[PDB]
Amino acid sequence: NNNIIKFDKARFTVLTEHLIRIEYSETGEFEERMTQMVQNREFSEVNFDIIEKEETIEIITSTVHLYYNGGEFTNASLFADVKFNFSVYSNRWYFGEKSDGNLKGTTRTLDMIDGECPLEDGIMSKNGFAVLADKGKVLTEVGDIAGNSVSTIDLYLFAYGRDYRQALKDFYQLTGNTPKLPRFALGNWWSRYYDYSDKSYLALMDKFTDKKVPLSVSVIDMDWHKVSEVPSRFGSGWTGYSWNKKLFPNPENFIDELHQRKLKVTLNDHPADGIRAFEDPYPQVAQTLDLNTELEEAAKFDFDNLKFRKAYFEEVHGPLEKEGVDFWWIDWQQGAISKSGVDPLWLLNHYQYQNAQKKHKNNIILSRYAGPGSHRYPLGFSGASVISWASLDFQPYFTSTASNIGYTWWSHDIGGHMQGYKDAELSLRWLQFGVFSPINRLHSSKSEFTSKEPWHFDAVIEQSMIDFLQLRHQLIPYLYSANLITASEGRALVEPLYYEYPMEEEAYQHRNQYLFGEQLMVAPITEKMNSLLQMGSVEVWFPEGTWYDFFSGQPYDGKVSLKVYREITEMPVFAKAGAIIPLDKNPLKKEEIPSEIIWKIFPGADGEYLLLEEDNETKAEFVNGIFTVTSKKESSRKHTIIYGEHEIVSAKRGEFSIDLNGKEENFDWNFSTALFRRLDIAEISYEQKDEILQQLSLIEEHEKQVAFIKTNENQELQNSLFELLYSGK
Amino acid sequence: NNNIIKFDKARFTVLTEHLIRIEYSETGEFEERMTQMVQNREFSEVNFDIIEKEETIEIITSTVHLYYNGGEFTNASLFADVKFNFSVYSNRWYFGEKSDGNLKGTTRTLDMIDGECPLEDGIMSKNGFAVLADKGKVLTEVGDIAGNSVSTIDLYLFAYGRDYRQALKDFYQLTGNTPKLPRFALGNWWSRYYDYSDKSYLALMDKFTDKKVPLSVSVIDMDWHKVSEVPSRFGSGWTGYSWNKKLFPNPENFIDELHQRKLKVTLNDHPADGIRAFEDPYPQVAQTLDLNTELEEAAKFDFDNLKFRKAYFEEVHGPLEKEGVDFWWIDWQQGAISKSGVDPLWLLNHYQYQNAQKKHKNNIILSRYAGPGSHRYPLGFSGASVISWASLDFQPYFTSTASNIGYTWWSHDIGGHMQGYKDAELSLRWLQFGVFSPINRLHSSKSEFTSKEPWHFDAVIEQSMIDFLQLRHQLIPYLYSANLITASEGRALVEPLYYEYPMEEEAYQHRNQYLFGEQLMVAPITEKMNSLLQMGSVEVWFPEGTWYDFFSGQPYDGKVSLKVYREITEMPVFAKAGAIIPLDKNPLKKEEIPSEIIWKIFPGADGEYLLLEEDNETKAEFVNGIFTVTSKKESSRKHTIIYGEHEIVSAKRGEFSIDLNGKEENFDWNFSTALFRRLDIAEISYEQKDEILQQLSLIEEHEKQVAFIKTNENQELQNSLFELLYSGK
Ligand SMILES: OC[C@H]1O[C@H](O[C@@H]2[C@@H](O)[C@@H](O)O[C@H](CO)[C@H]2O)[C@H](O)[C@@H](O)[C@@H]1O
Ligand SMILES: OC[C@H]1O[C@H](O[C@@H]2[C@@H](O)[C@@H](O)O[C@H](CO)[C@H]2O)[C@H](O)[C@@H](O)[C@@H]1O
């Protein structure tokens, strides 16, 4: 209560030096209960100053002056100046007004979105402040909706300046941390809106195995249940809780077959038409909810109702879980209306996520975003994106920006959901992004033409998709370790560049560029290739330091902004000198944790990586060319070491140290080989190819090689050749 | 009161299985009085089911579940599920919310509209439900405004699925049927915003006669009254009730001359500036309304005021009716403001239509649309459209869609009203549409350059316009019979395709295509011709069955979507095998009812037509090749029979039967003649003409003729030649 101040009809709680709760109450009673958004207001004491007069109060922290002149909250009575100079005159917050600078957050869904859509604000601002209004209902101690807050205005003023990571950590302290995901969530998911049989689904899973594509999750979309078989008097077949017996004559046996293949199983649930009289569970639900069965009274969807929720979980979901369903895909698109005023999507995510923990430890849902704090109910499901280059070009930005409201587990339909147009290169670029996204779930529309199976495409596209799908499983150790860091430390897997580089203007000018964990920087290509180059491109900002392409070892001297070119089969992913990345050596092998880790080391600096696991922690240190691996607990795990180009240690057990000062630091990547390959694939004149190869071979001085390419009439070819010269400088 | 249910502060009236009145009352009193919209709530008893609990009620009909959870009406408390599967999740109505599917209705006016404008919703939805809010004032038993309803919310839930015609019939039962039009309303009207004299107007009417163009109505626009002669102290000359004596020195004599030519006469009335002190009727109105004549107090327009309305009808209109004015063109553009809150346009249409019945049986007005139920006051006047291809291309869609709110007598300015641009082909296409529209009124702006006289144009355009104007009068029997069917059975003359073909997707994809009565299907051409073809075109959907061009006999096998091409002088109008269409044999002859009917029969199927008239009903039956004509009452009428190509019976009196099994079924239309004509008019290379004529003559197999035209480099020429091959298959 030292950090609590009352003045007129207002209450101010100084939670941190940079976070102030602001309340109004007509009744002089203020709200202590949790809300849909806020789970915890216990924060360590902080120092601040007050100037309290007859008519006014000023609260002063290290970063903000908050002023209240009494009366009802207006833009004139309640306002704040930040103690920063990030702008010339955008340093003042006025109650109920917008200011410039917000770096945005996320939105409910990408349903029906072709390219960009507007986002809600987040808690991050280039000008150093943000206000997060709490407009939600209060909860009970066990987490049911209690009704309206007695704080009829309840706001959180964030004044973290450009300390974005601390703003997000303290947001997680206020709204609750993200829970740990289970390891299975981080592998490849298969999904398709397609009327598979038990037989054709298992045949497809076995084809994945034959094709060397690993999967963690088998999604079964809505054709699992009755659709066309629903009498039209009941409405549509969109909602269903009854297996189609022609396609799934023995559901538990089919789910047992997926479980024997080490797949987790989820079903699509369209909840909005509730439980109607044709459904297999209807007789039990009708008994529980005292429905008029002779008038075929439906159990209408009503998540405000405790008895409805219990019948839904116990008598509708329950029998399907007993057949082996592992977790629920909540696919809600029917609006925000309820008698309580609570969004039905929030009620579903909150209650289903809680219910999911009963049968499985660290279980998930798959559902759309339900507003600030809904990160407590992973995973995010963005929905029915339009299949286009424009949609892909929006999606990396969308994903990293979501970290600004703490929603760090978006699962996008990889390759896009529906409508749009066919382009196998779009499908391949989208999968590249997906593999370097929070979740890699392949999914598609009801079209006969939109399957994301790699072997849908030509041999080049197929092989590249298989390679990227294998890479996702190689990355599960790195992903699972980052997941435990999200849960315990409040750090997002995917960060916008400005989290690490808040004072670099270029960190705000590369919307689709992001940090992926702590060791990798990703610049997805999201534009159709230039046919004259047979390469796509993206402008990359390289921070200070020496950077390596993660795949090729091509080097780049930061700090620089440089257009980079890749063939459709290659993705721009970069690691600094000293980076250490663990990889599963056996990504196809079905085993709860890897029996073998590859330690991939980028030479040129010291580094360190901590591999967090279910039942271990393993530290890899690279210090003055000595690489050491230690673990809390011992195991039979075999460690492989790759130092730049070369495997140094194969399948060594236990803790150890090896000196790498003696070993070759340099990657094989060389200017001449890369130049020949770019000229060779280009759809340009052979005379141009001959002249460029000859002149760049003959001209010795780097500055004169650049002058030569500066004369080229092909402006994009100049930029491609300039990237090679910059790396070879 | 079995079909009436009260619950909390609500009342539900189950009017049909598919129509429910929904009311809220704070006072517990509910509204029994008629409203501006609703004239009748007497409906036959229907069966339905109720589930009534302590806190909730559910009403169940054959097609809808209506739910009310008590309290004030909100999107959460009042909602409905339809018992249809036309959509996957657009089958729920929420109070105060919009859903997808509405097929739209109409709007007040096309004043200042160049092309499309937004329309209001109608009662028709592809998803099977619509809500019609009653926001109007209550009426007295005699039809004066009584004030505010005691049902402060009063809604009609329509749940007819895709039974659009029954929805419209029951809408007419609720809001009152359309009245019968008089026969004169269905002929050609002449109108022009032009300062004619008595002499020049009669000279123009006599020129129509000399030119073989029949007219039913002589409109006199606002230059009938003082305009420039109004002193500026009184405001403008827009409103006027005083003849310009220079132009009309003897009005009654001039109107007697129009009456001797068998014309009905209407004057433009701009009511909004009321009756000012310069007007001829002002001294009488001033006496009646106790105005201060020495301060020249105006009788301001006030249709809320009983004494104003009586002075307007009796002392302003009355003297002009005594001079011979037959009906009123109410031309109101001055807004929706009144102290009552009732739109002055509604007050004008309601009261003027009632007043018009005093001197003439089944009299009309001509006025803009005044909201749902204003079909009770025909005719609709769409107003000041911009003269453009875009305006014409909107107008068929506009006209058929208006049937969805029961407003089936739109009169458009044929050829467009004002601004826009000159194109004699646009004028001709617009007249083609007009002739196949509810009303065929030629009208134009104050421009010296926008007259719709046929002889304004070149000899080709003039002759075609004269032919279409004669065709309108040939169609009056068919129109008048359809008019009596609108009045008695609630069936629109102009129907969207989806009224007849609700489950055919193509019936929703041909916006400008419509049924015209029960025997004809119209696809107006509303795009400028392709100069290379010298033909315009429209994509026609042909339903199942055998169809014939009404003019040429060109055949088409349904079901198919086919681009059809016509010269600027020809319009796509189609009749099914078995169609029977009556035509006036003597459209120029002035006679109250035709002394001679042509029965035009399309061979290939049975058919039937009922000709409703003022004092008769005549049935034409075509059954197993036997054509029979019978009538309720006998007459001297002479019947002509045309069976396909050939006149079989000329001028036969009385009831009779003739066997047509022996007679030639086939039209003359043939592929070779039509091919030669299309190639001959085309502005293409003579070498192409020669090759196409030669190859299509030489190649015998239909499939190889199509393959030949498929190679043509002119893509539109392919489609034109494909139409001929499809008809000749
Ligand atoms: O469960 C089937 C899919 O439903 C939702 O997407 C639908 C989409 O595939 C298509 O049918 O259009 C409708 C209307 O826009 C969508 O609701 C889910 O978003 C999707 O993931 C499912 O596969
Ligand atoms: O009575 C004359 C015409 O008045 C209305 O149209 C006017 C139009 O012709 C022009 O003068 O522009 C004004 C302003 O937009 C319009 O009010 C009627 O719509 C028209 O039918 C009359 O001929």
Author numbering:
A (entry chain A), B (entry chain A): 11 to 739
What does the paper say about this structure?
Within this cluster, we showed that a GH31_u1 protein from Lactococcus lactis (LlGH31_u1) and its fungal homolog demonstrated hydrolytic activities against nigerose [α-D-Glcp-(1→3)-D-Glc]. The kcat/Km values of LlGH31_u1 against kojibiose and maltose were 13% and 2.1% of that against nigerose, indicating that LlGH31_u1 has a higher specificity to the α-1,3 linkage of nigerose than other characterized GH31 enzymes, including eukaryotic enzymes. Furthermore, the three-dimensional structures of LlGH31_u1 determined using X-ray crystallography and cryogenic electron microscopy revealed that LlGH31_u1 forms a hexamer and has a C-terminal domain comprising four α-helices, suggesting that it contributes to hexamerization. Finally, crystal structures in complex with nigerooligosaccharides and kojibiose along with mutational analysis revealed the active site residues involved in substrate recognition in this enzyme. This study reports the first structure of a bacterial GH31 α-1,3-glucosidase and provides new insight into the substrate specificity of GH31 enzymes and the physiological functions of bacterial and fungal GH31_u1 members.
In accordance, the structures of inactive mutant D394A, in which the catalytic acid/base D394 was substituted with alanine, and the structure of complexes with nigerose (D394A-Nig2), nigerotriose (D394A-Nig3), nigerotetraose (D394A-Nig4), and kojibiose (D394A-Koj2) were also determined. In D394A-Nig3 and WT-Glc, both the α- and β-anomers of the ligand were modeled, while an electron density map for α-nigerose, α-nigerotetraose, and α-kojibiose was observed in D394A-Nig2, D394A-Nig4, and D394A-Koji2, respectively. In the −1 subsite, the Glc−1 of all ligands (glucose, nigerose, nigerotriose, nigerotetraose, and kojibiose) are accommodated in the active site pocket in almost the same manner and recognized by surrounding residues via hydrogen bonds and hydrophobic interaction. In the subsite +1, in addition to three hydrogen bonds with the catalytic site of A-domain, Tyr99 on the N-domain of an adjacent protomer forms a hydrogen bond with the 4-OH group of Glc+1 of nigerooligosaccharides. In the D394A-Koj2 structure, the Glc+1 adopts the same chair 4C1 conformation as in the D394A-Nig2, but its sugar ring is overturned. In the NtMGAM–acarbose complex, the α-D-6-deoxy-glucopyranose residue adopts the same 4C1 chair conformation as the Glc+1 of nigerose in D394A-Nig2, but the pyranose ring is overturned. However, because LlGH31_u1 lacks additional space surrounding the 2-OH group of Glc+1 of nigerooligosaccharides, the 6-OH group of maltose may have difficulty fitting into the catalytic pocket.
